[PDB]
Write an enzyme that holds these catalytic residues in place. Structure first.
Site, PDB file in Angstrom:
ATOM      1  N   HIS A  75      25.795  21.395  38.023  1.00  0.00           N
ATOM      2  CA  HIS A  75      26.848  22.683  38.033  1.00  0.00           C
ATOM      3  C   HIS A  75      26.127  23.772  38.038  1.00  0.00           C
ATOM      4  CE1 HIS A  75      26.744  22.158  33.492  1.00  0.00           C
ATOM      5  NE2 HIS A  75      27.183  23.529  33.562  1.00  0.00           N
ATOM      6  N   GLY A  96      26.879  28.410  28.054  1.00  0.00           N
ATOM      7  CA  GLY A  96      25.168  29.213  28.423  1.00  0.00           C
ATOM      8  C   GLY A  96      24.211  28.370  27.709  1.00  0.00           C
ATOM      9  N   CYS A 148      23.888  25.234  28.756  1.00  0.00           N
ATOM     10  CA  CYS A 148      23.395  24.034  29.566  1.00  0.00           C
ATOM     11  C   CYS A 148      22.152  24.486  29.906  1.00  0.00           C
ATOM     12  CB  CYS A 148      24.576  23.912  30.685  1.00  0.00           C
ATOM     13  SG  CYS A 148      25.711  23.041  30.140  1.00  0.00           S
ATOM     14  N   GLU A 204      24.401  14.647  36.434  1.00  0.00           N
ATOM     15  CA  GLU A 204      24.634  16.110  35.966  1.00  0.00           C
ATOM     16  C   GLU A 204      23.046  16.601  36.053  1.00  0.00           C
ATOM     17  OE1 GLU A 204      27.269  17.529  36.652  1.00  0.00           O
ATOM     18  OE2 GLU A 204      26.593  19.498  36.095  1.00  0.00           O
TER      19      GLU A 204
END
Ligand SMILES: *[C@@H](O)[C@H](C[C@@H]1CCNC1=O)NC(=O)[C@H](CC(C)C)NC(=O)OCc1ccccc1
Length: 184
Positions: free
Chosen positions: A44, A149, A151, A75
Site C-alpha cells: 500500500h 507512519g 508501516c 502486503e
C-alpha cells in the site's frame, strides 16, 4: 547483563546498513534493503516509477506485489532499484519458516518516527486478516499500539529478520511475515 541487550543491539546493527527511509507518493516508509538492489515496502506504499531515498530520486526497475498460492495479498512488494550501491545481503538472517518470537523489536525510521526501537514482545502467527478492508495472508500479530507512519517497519528478534509492519487496529500491530524463499 549489558545495559543494551542482544535484541536491541541486533536491531540497531541491522537497521544501520539495511533500513532506509523511502518516500513514495503515499509518504515516508521505513524500508528494508534485502540484498543487491532489492528492497521491500508495504504494497500500500504504492511505489511508482521512482522513490526518494536520502533526498535523491531513485528509479524503480520493477515492483512485484507478493501473494500466496491462493492469490491472497501478502502486503509485501519487492522493488528493484536502479543504482550501483548494494545492500548488505541479509537473506541468511531471514528465516526459511514463518517465525514467531517471545521478544520482537519493531524498527521504524522516518522523519516522523526517527530511530524508533520498540520491544513489542510476543510476535505470533495470525494468518488471514482483513486489514481495514485489505484482505491479507501470513500476518504476524503483536500487542503494541502501532500507528500510521510505522508501516514498512521491520520486526526482528535476535539473529532474525521476521516481519514487516503493515497494519494495526489500535491495540495490536500486524506484520507481513518474511521468509527467505521470497528473495531467492
Ligand atoms: C501503515 O501504513 C498503517 C499502520 C496502521 C495504521 C493504524 N495502526 C497501524 O499500525 N497501515 C494501515 O493503515 C493499513 C493499510 C492496509 C491497506 C494494509 N490498514 C490497517 O491497519 O487497517 C486498520 C485495521 C487493521 C486490522 C483490523 C481492522 C482495522
Amino acid at each position: 547483563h549489558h545495559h543494551h541487550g542482544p535484541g536491541f543491539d541486533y536491531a540497531v546493527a541491522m537497521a544501520k546498513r539495511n533500513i532506509v527511509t523511502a518516500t513514495t507518493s503515499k509518504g515516508e516508509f521505513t524500508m528494508l534493503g534485502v540484498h543487491d538492489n532489492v528492497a521491500i515496502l508495504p504494497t500500500h506504499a504504492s511505489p511508482g516509477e521512482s522513490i526518494v531515498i536520502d533526498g535523491k530520486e531513485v528509479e524503480i526497475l520493477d515492483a512485484k506485489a507478493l501473494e500466496d498460492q491462493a492469490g491472497t495479498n501478502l502486503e509485501i512488494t519487492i522493488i528493484t532499484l536502479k543504482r550501483n550501491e548494494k545492500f548488505r545481503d541479509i537473506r541468511p538472517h531471514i528465516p526459511t519458516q514463518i517465525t514467531e518470537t517471545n521478544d520482537g523489536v519493531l524498527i521504524v525510521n522516518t522523519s516522523k518516527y526517527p530511530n524508533m526501537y520498540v520491544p513489542v514482545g510476543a510476535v505470533t502467527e495470525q494468518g488471514y486478516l482483513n486489514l481495514g478492508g485489505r484482505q491479507t495472508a501470513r500476518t504476524l500479530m503483536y500487542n503494541f499500539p502501532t500507528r500510521a507512519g510505522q508501516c514498512g517497519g521491520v520486526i526482528t528478534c535476535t539473529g532474525k529478520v521476521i516481519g514487516m509492519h503493515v497494519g494495526g487496529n489500535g491495540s495490536h500491530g500486524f506484520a507481513a511475515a518474511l521468509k527467505r524463499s521470497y528473495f531467492t
